[PDB]
């Protein structure tokens, strides 16, 4: 699983000490954190391509904080895809609270950019503006997260036309395909370095892709000092990492889904005041189980076209699913509903020409076996979707490097049974749908749970004991 990018420095250099940062950055992070800072002060821009799940953002936060204790942060810009925008806020506010940030959506409006340490924004939110160009930002981070695939375009011309003093770029894996993107990013980070696009492709792209281990090695050589990339499989790193890393993957609902949600929300209320008793615990639990399906995929209700475009989960899943693939992982996707499972299998199975053994309850032991066997042994099989309700018939998922909870998991006994993260470290993803019971319940639980952990049981159940006042708080869609 070779895919590690070097940049000499692991013997000395300024192993900076994270500043006001609530966390114990594994050694490999304190380094990256520092290396970036180093190259930044030196005046070079760099790309951090560590496998998704090793927290390039935390390191980037540190890079941000250490540039605070030096009067080189206020103001900095971070251009991330809507999706990750939550992850960012999630982490600044938490890890580096002492750092002022603010999202920058549509129209100009109230500007205090210069007064804010960092400001968040989307590529699009750039493509149509001016407000920012005026600003002279210290840092300018381009977070090309696992976002779809086409990142380049007139967008870079916009970015690559701003005013920074420091430049970082968080990305997936320098895939030999990314070549043409490599020019765009390297340029952004270090302008001129590669010349012109025309020039680039001409002597690098067309040849390398056309099989030229010559210009290939060369290009690698020339950029080597500006790209740092650690691998979840790097022996040196397998160690510093926990058995399981937990990440929250956010997704935003399509306007269809959004509609179906608000609707299906009003329909439980405009028909609840009346009913009551266990004829409310059944009614509520019914709505919930529809909202959950809406977010998963509306084709689950309106029937119809089972496409990626109709589901925000599916879109995000697809991105995440894809980077993990490039990082050479083996993914396991779990879904509450059997049909969402088939949809997932289909979409993936089709869109990537590859088998996606699907495992669900009703299925002879032989199959569950042959399927899980197919996923375990066969290195060709890289996915497995599972829709199981039982405690754990007989699921052996030790081969999984990554796991996605398509449906909100509301467990250790479960992970143990399925053998997740037993004989390999494993990264686990929880899909969250912004402005949804999926998000709010995620909130109320971490509230205390000193009354919810020992007492109350599984997620679905109790959500119904909620008295209208808060039920209308938790489930009510929330988009400002």
CA–CA distance from 237 to each of 24, 94, 403 (Å)? 15, 25, 19
| Residue whose tokens read 């996707």 | 333
Q: Are 38 and 13 in contact (CB under 8 A)?
A: yes
In the chain, what is the greatest distance between 2 CA atoms, to the nearest angstrom? 76
The whole-angstrom separation of Cα 336 and Cα 110 is 43
User: Cβ distance 443 to 435 under 8 Å?
Assistant: no
Nearer to Hg ion, 254 or 387 (CB): 254
Residue 197 CB, nearest distance to Hg ion (Å)?
16
Give residue 150's Cα distance to chain centre.
Answer: 17
Query: Which single residue brings its beta carbon nearest to Hg ion?
Result: 312
Separation of alpha carbons 168 and 57, rounded Å: 11
Helix (H) or strand (E) holding 142: strand 139-143
**CB of 320: closest distance to Hg ion in angstroms?**
13
Q: Which lies closer to Hg ion via its Cβ, residue 32 or residue 312?
A: 312
Query: At which residue do the structure tokens 């976002």 appear?
Result: 147
d(CA 244, CA 240): 12
Q: Smallest Cα–Cα separation from 287: which of 443, 457, 480, 468?
A: 468
Q: Cβ closer to Hg ion: 287 or 433?
A: 433
- Nearer to Hg ion by Cβ, of 101 and 233: the residue is 101
The distance of closest approach from Cβ of residue 444 to Hg ion in the complex, given in angstroms and rounded to an integer, is 19
In this structure, are residues 79 and 141 in contact, taking their beta carbons and an 8 Å threshold?
yes
The verdict on whether omega for the bond into residue 75 sits within 30 degrees of 0, i.e. cis, is: yes
CB of 252 to Hg ion, least distance (A): 6
CB of 415 or CB of 438, closer to Hg ion: 438
Q: How far is the CB of 45 from Hg ion (least distance, A)?
A: 11
State the nearest-atom distance from the C-beta of 21 to Hg ion, in Å.
21
- Which CB sits closer to Hg ion, 144 or 234? 144
The minimum distance between CB 212 and Hg ion, in angstroms, equals 19
CB 142, min distance to Hg ion, A: 10
The helix or strand, by DSSP H or E, that contains position 219, with its residue range, turns out to be helix 213-223
Q: Which is nearer to Hg ion, 75 or 312 (CB)?
A: 312
- Given the rule CB under 5 A, which residues bind Hg ion? 47, 80, 85, 120, 122, 227, 251, 253, 295, 312-313, 433
End-to-end CA distance of the chain: 44
Q: How many H-runs (helices) and E-runs (strands) does the chain carry?
A: 19, 13
What is the helix (H) or strand (E) element at residue 469, kind and residue range?
helix 468-474
Q: How far is the CB of 450 from Hg ion (least distance, A)?
A: 30
Q: For residues 253 and 400, which CB has a smaller minimum distance to Hg ion in the complex? A: 253
- Give 120 or 388: the residue with its C-beta nearer to Hg ion: 120
Nearest to residue 22, comparing CAs of 86, 99, 118?
A: 99
**Cβ atoms within 10 A of the Cβ of 80, count?**
22
């Amino acid at each position: 699983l070779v895919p590690r990018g070097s940049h000499m420095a692991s013997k000395s250099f300024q192993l900076l000490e994270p500043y006001n940062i609530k966390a114990n950055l594994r050694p490999y992070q304190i380094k990256g954190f520092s290396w970036m800072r180093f190259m930044n002060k030196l005046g070079f821009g760099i790309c951090l391509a560590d496998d998704m799940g090793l927290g390039k953002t935390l390191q980037t936060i540190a890079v941000f904080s250490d540039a605070k204790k030096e009067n080189e942060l206020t103001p900095s810009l971070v251009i991330c895809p809507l999706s990750v925008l939550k992850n960012w806020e999630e982490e600044l506010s938490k890890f580096a609270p002492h750092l002022r940030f603010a999202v920058f959506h549509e129209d100009r409006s109230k500007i205090k950019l210069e007064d804010y340490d960092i400001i968040l924004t989307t590529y699009a939110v750039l493509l149509r503006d001016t407000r920012l160009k005026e600003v002279e930002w210290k840092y300018i981070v381009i977070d090309e997260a696992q976002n779809i695939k086409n990142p380049q375009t007139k967008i870079f011309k916009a970015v690559k036309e701003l005013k920074s003093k420091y430049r970082i770029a968080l990305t997936g894996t320098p895939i030999e395909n990314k070549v043409d993107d490599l020019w765009s990013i390297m340029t952004f980070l270090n302008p001129g370095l590669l010349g012109s696009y025309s020039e680039f492709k001409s002597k690098f792209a067309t040849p390398i892709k056309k099989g030229d281990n010559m210009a290939k090695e060369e290009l690698k050589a020339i950029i080597s000092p500006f790209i740092l990339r650690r691998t979840k499989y790097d022996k040196a790193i397998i160690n510093d990492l926990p058995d399981k890393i937990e990440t929250n993957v956010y997704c935003n609902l399509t306007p269809e889904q959004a509609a179906m949600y608000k609707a299906e929300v009003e329909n439980l209320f405009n028909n609840i005041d009346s009913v009551t008793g266990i004829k409310r615990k059944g009614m509520i639990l019914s709505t919930l189980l529809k909202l959950k399906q809406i977010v998963d995929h509306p084709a689950l209700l309106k029937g119809g076209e089972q496409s990626v475009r109709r589901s925000g989960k599916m879109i995000r899943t697809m991105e995440i699913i894809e980077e993990a693939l490039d990082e050479g992982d083996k993914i396991a996707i779990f879904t509450q509903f059997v049909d969402m499972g088939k949809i997932i299998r289909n979409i993936i199975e089709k869109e990537l020409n590859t088998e996606v053994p699907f495992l669900y309850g009703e299925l002879s032991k032989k199959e569950r076996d042959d399927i899980i066997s197919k996923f375990q042994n066969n290195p060709s099989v890289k996915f497995i979707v599972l829709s199981v309700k039982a405690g754990g018939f007989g699921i052996n998922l030790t081969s999984a490097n990554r796991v996605i909870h398509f449906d909100r998991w509301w467990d250790q006994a479960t992970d143990r049974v399925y053998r997740i993260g037993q004989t390999r470290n494993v990264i686990v993803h929880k899909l969250i749908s912004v402005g949804t019971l999926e998000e709010k319940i995620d909130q109320l639980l971490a509230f205390k749970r000193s009354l919810f952990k020992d007492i109350i049981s599984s997620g679905d159940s109790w959500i119904t004991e909620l008295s209208t006042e808060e039920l209308r708080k938790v489930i009510e869609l929330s988009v400002g």
